[PDB]
Design an enzyme around this catalytic site. Structure first.
Site, PDB file in Angstrom:
ATOM      1  N   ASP A  44     -13.753   7.073  10.071  1.00 37.75           N
ATOM      2  CA  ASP A  44     -13.166   7.048   8.594  1.00 37.75           C
ATOM      3  C   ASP A  44     -13.314   5.731   8.497  1.00 37.75           C
ATOM      4  O   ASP A  44     -12.506   4.737   7.027  1.00 37.75           O
ATOM      5  CB  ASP A  44     -11.777   7.096   8.204  1.00 37.75           C
ATOM      6  CG  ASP A  44     -11.649   7.619   6.952  1.00 37.75           C
ATOM      7  OD1 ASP A  44     -12.251   7.875   5.385  1.00 37.75           O
ATOM      8  OD2 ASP A  44     -10.193   7.853   6.738  1.00 37.75           O
ATOM      9  N   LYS A 100       3.205   0.023   9.185  1.00 36.05           N
ATOM     10  CA  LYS A 100       2.609   0.845   8.546  1.00 36.05           C
ATOM     11  C   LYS A 100       3.928   2.194   8.576  1.00 36.05           C
ATOM     12  O   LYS A 100       3.970   2.324   9.989  1.00 36.05           O
ATOM     13  CB  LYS A 100       0.889   1.637   8.760  1.00 36.05           C
ATOM     14  CG  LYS A 100       0.762   2.770   7.712  1.00 36.05           C
ATOM     15  CD  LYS A 100      -0.702   3.327   8.595  1.00 36.05           C
ATOM     16  CE  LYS A 100      -1.065   4.569   8.061  1.00 36.05           C
ATOM     17  NZ  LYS A 100      -2.562   4.927   8.477  1.00 36.05           N
ATOM     18  N   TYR A 133      -0.681   9.509   3.561  1.00 33.59           N
ATOM     19  CA  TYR A 133      -0.620   7.880   4.578  1.00 33.59           C
ATOM     20  C   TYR A 133       1.089   8.097   4.799  1.00 33.59           C
ATOM     21  O   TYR A 133       1.703   7.974   6.023  1.00 33.59           O
ATOM     22  CB  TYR A 133      -1.590   7.660   5.256  1.00 33.59           C
ATOM     23  CG  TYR A 133      -1.286   6.069   4.246  1.00 33.59           C
ATOM     24  CD1 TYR A 133      -0.468   4.950   4.469  1.00 33.59           C
ATOM     25  CD2 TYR A 133      -1.940   6.340   3.078  1.00 33.59           C
ATOM     26  CE1 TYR A 133      -0.061   4.279   3.573  1.00 33.59           C
ATOM     27  CE2 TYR A 133      -2.138   4.782   2.729  1.00 33.59           C
ATOM     28  CZ  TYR A 133      -0.968   3.808   3.409  1.00 33.59           C
ATOM     29  OH  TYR A 133      -1.055   2.624   2.131  1.00 33.59           O
ATOM     30  N   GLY A 134       1.553   7.632   4.024  1.00 33.02           N
ATOM     31  CA  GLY A 134       2.778   6.999   3.299  1.00 33.02           C
ATOM     32  C   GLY A 134       2.816   5.733   2.929  1.00 33.02           C
ATOM     33  O   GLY A 134       2.070   5.485   2.124  1.00 33.02           O
ATOM     34  N   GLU A 135       3.138   4.256   3.565  1.00 34.83           N
ATOM     35  CA  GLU A 135       3.606   3.047   3.377  1.00 34.83           C
ATOM     36  C   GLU A 135       2.866   2.034   3.412  1.00 34.83           C
ATOM     37  O   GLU A 135       3.024   2.295   5.351  1.00 34.83           O
ATOM     38  CB  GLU A 135       5.087   2.457   2.621  1.00 34.83           C
ATOM     39  CG  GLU A 135       5.181   3.908   1.415  1.00 34.83           C
ATOM     40  CD  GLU A 135       6.194   3.556   1.219  1.00 34.83           C
ATOM     41  OE1 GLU A 135       7.375   2.604   1.801  1.00 34.83           O
ATOM     42  OE2 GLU A 135       7.265   4.106  -0.254  1.00 34.83           O
ATOM     43  N   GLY A 141       0.531  -1.025   0.052  1.00 25.13           N
ATOM     44  CA  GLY A 141      -0.094  -0.161  -0.563  1.00 25.13           C
ATOM     45  C   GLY A 141       0.941   0.838  -0.112  1.00 25.13           C
ATOM     46  O   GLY A 141       2.270   1.507   0.600  1.00 25.13           O
ATOM     47  N   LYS A 142       0.610   1.923  -0.650  1.00 24.14           N
ATOM     48  CA  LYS A 142       1.573   3.021  -0.992  1.00 24.14           C
ATOM     49  C   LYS A 142       0.749   4.732  -0.804  1.00 24.14           C
ATOM     50  O   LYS A 142      -0.868   4.059  -1.934  1.00 24.14           O
ATOM     51  CB  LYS A 142       2.174   3.554  -2.128  1.00 24.14           C
TER      52      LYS A 142
END
Ligand SMILES: COc1cc(-c2cncc(-c3ccc(C4CCN(C)CC4)cc3)c2C)cc(OC)c1OC
Ligand SMILES: COc1cc(-c2cncc(-c3ccc(C4CCN(C)CC4)cc3)c2C)cc(OC)c1OC
Ligand SMILES: COc1cc(-c2cncc(-c3ccc(C4CCN(C)CC4)cc3)c2C)cc(OC)c1OC
Length: 282
Positions: free
Chosen positions: A131, A34, A18-20, A14-15
């Site tokens: 969220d 994360k 938020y970052g990775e 995931g990227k």
């Protein structure tokens, strides 16, 4: 004694802003790591503050392992259990569901959400997520899901994803001093997730393609105004296809999702009432 802290980062899964997120290995076991962008440090602080307050442990909440801050800049990592099937958003793109799998997914989400929402004395504070969406739900191998990302969570004793914002968030009428307000924003979002999943349930040889909520009325990366016009001004709601009304499960799910989408937040069902209704379907 040796305190083994090395995590081998193996692949990025995931990227984003938020970052990775990385699949990593600790002592031979998969973990999820994360790594926060500078832009989103306050999400690491809020999730860490919450877990320092209450060590949540529930089969439908992503399992916490560690918060790490390392001096370099400051590097911020959140380490959790790893779910190799990925997010519900990911899963629904090219999986269809039967009645049993669809119900198991949505009742597991409702279970995790009711656990967040409920205050337990002697225990946990009540928690609202703020969220909830299909990308913040992971699929487990046993067919249940777990809720992830408490970076925006609020406790009682960054803003949400605009596509999933309740009408009172978009029209800025939300009662911000009232904790129940935040639970009702999660219920709205839950109803959208329930719609996303139900579309992928087969009945009578028919299924809908994966689409995100409001795909037919807003652009990609819709603006706050785009969403306010749809949800608040015109009071649109996601389409319920005719084919659902030939299937008892999807008929019941349509009624449920309607009762998460009332304009009046206090009319919406509670997570505990959603669980009870789901246990009586099929
Ligand atoms: C600091 O950092 C990280 C540490 C670890 C980790 C590695 N081995 C052992 C431990 C451990 C746990 C618990 C105790 C207890 C034993 C009973 N006694 C009464 C109190 C103390 C001791 C040692 C830990 C916590 C993993 C990490 O990542 C997965 C860490 O980095 C985030
Ligand atoms: C952070 O995460 C992981 C940590 C560990 C781990 C490593 N060393 C020691 C421990 C431990 C031992 C003993 C107590 C005590 C507490 C009080 N009383 C005396 C009874 C029990 C607590 C903690 C743990 C839990 C293993 C993990 O996985 C196998 C972890 O998961 C990645
Ligand atoms: C939403 O939030 C967080 C999620 C996670 C997390 C936990 N398990 C597994 C994953 C994952 C694994 C694999 C895939 C893909 C890889 C490519 N393949 C083609 C399909 C599968 C996707 C996702 C994630 C992203 C961890 C987090 O924190 C450490 C999160 O933040 C709170």
């Amino acid at each position: 004694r040796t305190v083994a802290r090395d995590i081998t980062l193996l692949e990025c899964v995931g990227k984003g802003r938020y970052g990775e997120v990385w699949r990593g290995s600790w002592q031979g076991e998969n973990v999820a790591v994360k790594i926060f962008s500078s832009r989103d440090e306050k999400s690491w602080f809020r999730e860490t503050e919450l877990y320092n307050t209450v060590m949540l442990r529930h089969e439908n909440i992503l399992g916490f392992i560690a918060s790490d801050m390392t001096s370099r800049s400051t590097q911020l990592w959140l380490i959790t259990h790893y779910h190799e099937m990925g997010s519900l958003y990911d899963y629904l793109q090219l999986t269809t569901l039967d009645t049993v799998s669809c119900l198991r997914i949505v009742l597991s989400i409702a279970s995790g959400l009711a656990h967040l929402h409920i205050e337990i004395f002697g225990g946990k504070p009540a928690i609202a997520h703020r969220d909830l969406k299909s990308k913040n739900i992971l699929v487990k191998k046993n067919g249940q899901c777990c809720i992830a990302d408490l970076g925006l969570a609020v406790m009682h004793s960054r803003v949400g994803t605009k596509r999933y914002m309740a009408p009172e968030v978009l029209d800025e009428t939300i009662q911000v001093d009232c904790f129940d307000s935040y639970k009702r924003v999660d219920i709205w979002a839950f109803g959208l997730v329930l719609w996303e999943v139900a579309r992928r349930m087969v009945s009578n040889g028919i299924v809908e393609d994966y689409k995100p909520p409001f795909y037919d009325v807003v652009p990609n990366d819709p603006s706050f105004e785009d969403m306010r016009k749809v949800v608040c001004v015109d009071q649109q709601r996601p389409n319920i296809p005719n084919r659902w009304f030939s299937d008892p499960t999807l008929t019941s799910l349509a009624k449920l999702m309607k009762e998460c989408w009332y304009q009046n937040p206090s009319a919406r069902l509670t997570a505990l009432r959603i669980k009870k209704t789901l246990t009586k379907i099929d």
